[PDB]
Design a protein around this ligand. Structure first.
Ligand SMILES: OC[C@H]1O[C@@H](O[C@@H]2[C@@H](O)[C@H](O[C@@H]3[C@@H](O)[C@H](O)O[C@H](CO)[C@H]3O)O[C@H](CO)[C@H]2O)[C@H](O)[C@@H](O)[C@@H]1O
Ligand code: CA
Ligand code: CA
Ligand code: CL
Ligand code: CL
Ligand code: CL
Ligand code: CL
Lengths: 128, 128
Protein backbone atom coordinates (compact mmCIF):
# COMPACT_ATOMS: atom_id res chain seq x y z
CA UNK A 1 0.00 0.00 0.00
CA UNK A 2 1.96 3.06 -1.18
CA UNK A 3 1.83 6.80 -2.01
CA UNK A 4 3.63 8.86 -4.54
CA UNK A 5 6.65 10.96 -3.79
CA UNK A 6 5.52 14.05 -1.95
CA UNK A 7 2.26 12.55 -0.88
CA UNK A 8 1.64 11.95 2.84
CA UNK A 9 0.06 8.77 4.19
CA UNK A 10 -2.59 9.12 6.79
CA UNK A 11 -5.52 6.96 7.88
CA UNK A 12 -6.31 5.15 4.75
CA UNK A 13 -5.17 7.61 2.12
CA UNK A 14 -2.44 9.55 0.51
CA UNK A 15 -2.76 13.33 0.60
CA UNK A 16 -1.11 15.96 -1.52
CA UNK A 17 -0.86 19.43 -0.11
CA UNK A 18 -0.78 21.61 -3.15
CA UNK A 19 1.04 24.78 -2.37
CA UNK A 20 0.01 26.29 -5.63
CA UNK A 21 -2.62 28.89 -6.49
CA UNK A 22 -5.75 27.88 -8.37
CA UNK A 23 -9.51 28.11 -8.65
CA UNK A 24 -11.74 25.45 -7.03
CA UNK A 25 -12.21 24.09 -10.52
CA UNK A 26 -8.53 24.32 -11.38
CA UNK A 27 -7.57 22.62 -8.10
CA UNK A 28 -10.07 19.98 -8.96
CA UNK A 29 -8.72 19.34 -12.51
CA UNK A 30 -5.19 19.23 -11.09
CA UNK A 31 -6.00 16.52 -8.49
CA UNK A 32 -7.85 14.56 -11.07
CA UNK A 33 -4.91 14.69 -13.46
CA UNK A 34 -2.83 12.90 -10.76
CA UNK A 35 -5.70 10.36 -10.55
CA UNK A 36 -6.79 11.76 -7.18
CA UNK A 37 -9.60 14.04 -6.04
CA UNK A 38 -10.13 16.93 -3.68
CA UNK A 39 -9.99 16.10 0.01
CA UNK A 40 -12.99 14.38 1.54
CA UNK A 41 -13.14 14.54 5.30
CA UNK A 42 -14.94 11.48 6.71
CA UNK A 43 -14.18 11.29 10.45
CA UNK A 44 -12.74 13.54 13.14
CA UNK A 45 -9.39 11.73 13.07
CA UNK A 46 -8.97 12.75 9.41
CA UNK A 47 -10.17 16.22 10.15
CA UNK A 48 -7.61 16.68 12.95
CA UNK A 49 -4.74 15.54 10.77
CA UNK A 50 -5.70 17.91 7.99
CA UNK A 51 -6.28 20.64 10.56
CA UNK A 52 -2.66 20.34 11.72
CA UNK A 53 -1.51 20.99 8.29
CA UNK A 54 -3.81 23.90 7.47
CA UNK A 55 -3.39 25.66 10.74
CA UNK A 56 0.39 25.48 10.51
CA UNK A 57 0.16 27.11 7.11
CA UNK A 58 -2.31 29.87 7.97
CA UNK A 59 -0.88 32.21 5.24
CA UNK A 60 -3.27 30.44 2.95
CA UNK A 61 -6.53 28.66 2.53
CA UNK A 62 -6.85 25.18 1.03
CA UNK A 63 -9.71 24.17 -1.29
CA UNK A 64 -11.40 20.95 -0.35
CA UNK A 65 -13.78 18.61 -2.15
CA UNK A 66 -16.93 20.19 -0.77
CA UNK A 67 -19.40 22.29 -2.75
CA UNK A 68 -23.01 22.94 -3.66
CA UNK A 69 -25.00 23.75 -6.78
CA UNK A 70 -27.96 25.78 -5.54
CA UNK A 71 -26.61 29.23 -4.65
CA UNK A 72 -28.37 28.28 -1.32
CA UNK A 73 -28.87 24.47 -1.36
CA UNK A 74 -27.40 21.37 0.35
CA UNK A 75 -23.56 20.76 0.55
CA UNK A 76 -22.19 17.59 -1.00
CA UNK A 77 -18.76 15.95 -1.18
CA UNK A 78 -16.77 15.37 -4.38
CA UNK A 79 -17.82 11.76 -4.23
CA UNK A 80 -21.52 12.84 -4.14
CA UNK A 81 -22.13 11.79 -0.55
CA UNK A 82 -24.11 14.23 1.60
CA UNK A 83 -22.54 16.52 4.16
CA UNK A 84 -22.96 15.77 7.80
CA UNK A 85 -21.19 18.13 10.19
CA UNK A 86 -19.54 15.67 12.58
CA UNK A 87 -16.18 17.29 12.51
CA UNK A 88 -17.01 20.85 11.57
CA UNK A 89 -19.70 23.17 10.24
CA UNK A 90 -19.20 25.46 7.22
CA UNK A 91 -18.81 29.14 8.17
CA UNK A 92 -20.35 32.46 6.92
CA UNK A 93 -23.77 30.82 6.92
CA UNK A 94 -26.42 33.59 7.32
CA UNK A 95 -28.74 33.86 4.20
CA UNK A 96 -27.35 37.09 2.53
CA UNK A 97 -23.55 36.65 2.94
CA UNK A 98 -23.66 33.02 1.67
CA UNK A 99 -24.90 34.13 -1.80
CA UNK A 100 -22.42 32.92 -4.58
CA UNK A 101 -20.16 31.27 -2.03
CA UNK A 102 -20.63 27.71 -3.14
CA UNK A 103 -17.20 26.14 -2.77
CA UNK A 104 -15.54 25.23 0.49
CA UNK A 105 -12.02 25.87 1.65
CA UNK A 106 -10.11 25.47 4.90
CA UNK A 107 -8.25 28.50 6.26
CA UNK A 108 -6.42 28.09 9.57
CA UNK A 109 -8.83 25.88 11.56
CA UNK A 110 -12.07 26.98 9.97
CA UNK A 111 -13.98 25.77 7.02
CA UNK A 112 -15.64 28.63 5.02
CA UNK A 113 -17.81 28.86 1.92
CA UNK A 114 -16.12 30.93 -0.69
CA UNK A 115 -16.60 32.07 -4.24
CA UNK A 116 -15.67 29.03 -6.33
CA UNK A 117 -13.07 30.64 -8.45
CA UNK A 118 -11.01 32.46 -5.95
CA UNK A 119 -7.42 31.43 -6.41
CA UNK A 120 -5.93 29.37 -3.61
CA UNK A 121 -4.09 26.28 -2.49
CA UNK A 122 -5.69 22.88 -2.31
CA UNK A 123 -5.48 19.37 -0.96
CA UNK A 124 -5.82 16.21 -3.07
CA UNK A 125 -6.67 12.81 -1.73
CA UNK A 126 -6.16 9.35 -3.15
CA UNK A 127 -7.71 6.46 -1.20
CA UNK A 128 -5.99 3.08 -0.70
CA UNK B 1 -6.69 -3.64 -20.09
CA UNK B 2 -10.16 -4.75 -18.84
CA UNK B 3 -13.75 -3.95 -17.62
CA UNK B 4 -16.01 -5.28 -14.96
CA UNK B 5 -18.92 -7.51 -15.76
CA UNK B 6 -21.65 -5.40 -17.27
CA UNK B 7 -19.45 -2.54 -18.12
CA UNK B 8 -19.04 -1.92 -21.85
CA UNK B 9 -15.66 -1.01 -23.32
CA UNK B 10 -15.36 1.82 -25.77
CA UNK B 11 -12.51 4.13 -26.85
CA UNK B 12 -10.41 4.49 -23.76
CA UNK B 13 -13.03 3.58 -21.21
CA UNK B 14 -15.41 1.28 -19.45
CA UNK B 15 -19.02 2.43 -19.14
CA UNK B 16 -21.92 1.43 -16.98
CA UNK B 17 -25.39 2.28 -18.05
CA UNK B 18 -27.25 2.36 -14.86
CA UNK B 19 -30.99 1.69 -15.00
CA UNK B 20 -31.76 2.75 -11.42
CA UNK B 21 -33.54 5.91 -10.59
CA UNK B 22 -31.47 8.27 -8.50
CA UNK B 23 -30.68 11.91 -8.03
CA UNK B 24 -27.67 13.49 -9.63
CA UNK B 25 -25.97 13.28 -6.23
CA UNK B 26 -27.13 9.73 -5.75
CA UNK B 27 -25.98 8.68 -9.22
CA UNK B 28 -22.67 10.35 -8.54
CA UNK B 29 -22.25 8.42 -5.26
CA UNK B 30 -23.13 5.09 -6.88
CA UNK B 31 -20.50 5.50 -9.63
CA UNK B 32 -17.97 6.51 -7.12
CA UNK B 33 -18.69 3.49 -5.01
CA UNK B 34 -17.76 1.25 -7.95
CA UNK B 35 -14.56 3.26 -8.15
CA UNK B 36 -15.67 5.36 -11.14
CA UNK B 37 -17.20 8.75 -11.92
CA UNK B 38 -20.16 10.07 -13.85
CA UNK B 39 -19.72 10.22 -17.62
CA UNK B 40 -17.37 12.79 -19.09
CA UNK B 41 -17.65 13.28 -22.80
CA UNK B 42 -14.31 14.27 -24.33
CA UNK B 43 -15.29 14.28 -28.05
CA UNK B 44 -17.61 13.43 -30.90
CA UNK B 45 -16.69 9.78 -31.02
CA UNK B 46 -17.50 9.29 -27.34
CA UNK B 47 -20.60 11.33 -27.76
CA UNK B 48 -21.93 9.29 -30.64
CA UNK B 49 -21.37 6.00 -28.84
CA UNK B 50 -23.22 7.30 -25.78
CA UNK B 51 -25.85 8.88 -27.99
CA UNK B 52 -26.90 5.54 -29.47
CA UNK B 53 -27.39 4.10 -26.03
CA UNK B 54 -29.37 7.11 -24.89
CA UNK B 55 -31.53 7.29 -28.04
CA UNK B 56 -32.36 3.59 -27.89
CA UNK B 57 -33.63 4.06 -24.38
CA UNK B 58 -35.72 7.23 -24.76
CA UNK B 59 -38.07 6.21 -21.88
CA UNK B 60 -35.56 7.66 -19.42
CA UNK B 61 -32.89 10.29 -19.17
CA UNK B 62 -29.36 9.52 -17.96
CA UNK B 63 -27.49 11.74 -15.50
CA UNK B 64 -23.99 12.67 -16.63
CA UNK B 65 -20.97 14.24 -15.00
CA UNK B 66 -21.69 17.83 -15.93
CA UNK B 67 -22.96 20.46 -13.50
CA UNK B 68 -22.56 24.06 -12.53
CA UNK B 69 -22.24 25.75 -9.14
CA UNK B 70 -24.28 28.82 -9.50
CA UNK B 71 -27.71 29.25 -11.03
CA UNK B 72 -26.15 31.06 -14.05
CA UNK B 73 -22.46 30.13 -14.19
CA UNK B 74 -19.96 28.10 -16.25
CA UNK B 75 -20.57 24.32 -16.76
CA UNK B 76 -17.79 22.03 -15.56
CA UNK B 77 -17.13 18.31 -15.77
CA UNK B 78 -16.80 15.85 -12.85
CA UNK B 79 -13.09 16.19 -13.22
CA UNK B 80 -13.03 20.00 -13.03
CA UNK B 81 -12.24 20.55 -16.70
CA UNK B 82 -14.33 23.30 -18.30
CA UNK B 83 -17.20 22.75 -20.72
CA UNK B 84 -16.59 23.31 -24.39
CA UNK B 85 -19.49 22.56 -26.75
CA UNK B 86 -17.53 20.21 -29.09
CA UNK B 87 -20.14 17.66 -29.56
CA UNK B 88 -23.33 19.25 -28.23
CA UNK B 89 -24.76 22.24 -26.34
CA UNK B 90 -26.83 22.17 -23.07
CA UNK B 91 -30.58 22.97 -23.64
CA UNK B 92 -33.38 25.04 -22.03
CA UNK B 93 -30.77 27.76 -22.19
CA UNK B 94 -32.37 31.25 -21.82
CA UNK B 95 -31.26 32.98 -18.50
CA UNK B 96 -34.73 32.72 -16.74
CA UNK B 97 -36.10 29.21 -17.47
CA UNK B 98 -32.82 27.42 -16.50
CA UNK B 99 -32.68 28.86 -12.91
CA UNK B 100 -32.26 26.00 -10.31
CA UNK B 101 -31.24 23.66 -13.13
CA UNK B 102 -27.58 23.04 -12.42
CA UNK B 103 -27.07 19.38 -13.29
CA UNK B 104 -27.04 17.86 -16.76
CA UNK B 105 -28.63 14.75 -18.13
CA UNK B 106 -29.05 13.18 -21.58
CA UNK B 107 -32.56 12.31 -22.75
CA UNK B 108 -32.93 10.72 -26.21
CA UNK B 109 -30.39 12.69 -28.27
CA UNK B 110 -30.47 15.96 -26.41
CA UNK B 111 -28.53 17.25 -23.44
CA UNK B 112 -30.71 19.24 -20.97
CA UNK B 113 -29.99 20.97 -17.68
CA UNK B 114 -32.26 19.89 -14.82
CA UNK B 115 -33.08 20.13 -11.09
CA UNK B 116 -30.13 18.19 -9.55
CA UNK B 117 -32.51 16.44 -7.27
CA UNK B 118 -34.67 14.78 -9.94
CA UNK B 119 -34.72 11.01 -10.21
CA UNK B 120 -33.21 9.29 -13.21
CA UNK B 121 -30.87 6.82 -14.70
CA UNK B 122 -27.21 7.51 -15.07
CA UNK B 123 -24.01 6.59 -16.83
CA UNK B 124 -20.69 5.85 -15.04
CA UNK B 125 -17.24 5.92 -16.49
CA UNK B 126 -13.89 4.50 -15.47
CA UNK B 127 -11.01 5.19 -17.85
CA UNK B 128 -8.51 2.42 -18.68
O1 LIG C 1 -14.72 10.30 -6.64
C1 LIG C 1 -14.26 9.36 -5.66
C2 LIG C 1 -13.62 8.17 -6.36
O2 LIG C 1 -12.57 8.63 -7.20
C3 LIG C 1 -12.04 7.58 -8.01
O3 LIG C 1 -11.07 8.13 -8.91
C4 LIG C 1 -11.33 8.84 -10.11
C5 LIG C 1 -10.02 9.01 -10.89
O4 LIG C 1 -9.58 7.74 -11.37
C6 LIG C 1 -10.21 9.96 -12.06
O5 LIG C 1 -8.97 10.16 -12.73
C7 LIG C 1 -9.08 9.83 -14.11
C8 LIG C 1 -7.86 9.00 -14.53
O6 LIG C 1 -7.91 7.72 -13.90
C9 LIG C 1 -7.82 8.83 -16.05
O7 LIG C 1 -6.64 8.11 -16.42
O8 LIG C 1 -7.82 10.11 -16.67
C10 LIG C 1 -9.04 10.81 -16.43
C11 LIG C 1 -9.05 12.10 -17.25
O9 LIG C 1 -7.82 12.81 -17.04
C12 LIG C 1 -9.19 11.10 -14.94
O10 LIG C 1 -10.46 11.71 -14.70
O11 LIG C 1 -10.70 11.21 -11.59
C13 LIG C 1 -12.01 11.09 -11.02
C14 LIG C 1 -12.55 12.47 -10.68
O12 LIG C 1 -11.68 13.10 -9.73
C15 LIG C 1 -11.96 10.19 -9.79
O13 LIG C 1 -13.28 10.00 -9.29
C16 LIG C 1 -11.39 6.53 -7.12
O14 LIG C 1 -10.93 5.44 -7.92
C17 LIG C 1 -12.36 6.02 -6.06
O15 LIG C 1 -11.65 5.23 -5.10
C18 LIG C 1 -13.05 7.18 -5.35
O16 LIG C 1 -14.11 6.67 -4.53
CA1 CA D 1 -11.22 11.23 3.30
CA1 CA E 1 -14.87 10.12 -21.45
CL1 CL F 1 -12.78 16.38 -6.97
CL1 CL G 1 -18.84 11.84 -10.46
CL1 CL H 1 -26.64 20.19 -29.59
CL1 CL I 1 -30.25 17.47 -30.04
Amino acid sequence: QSCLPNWIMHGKSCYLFSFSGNSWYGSKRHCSQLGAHLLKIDNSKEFEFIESQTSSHRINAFWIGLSRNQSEGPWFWEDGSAFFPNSFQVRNAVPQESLLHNCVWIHGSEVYNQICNTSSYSICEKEL
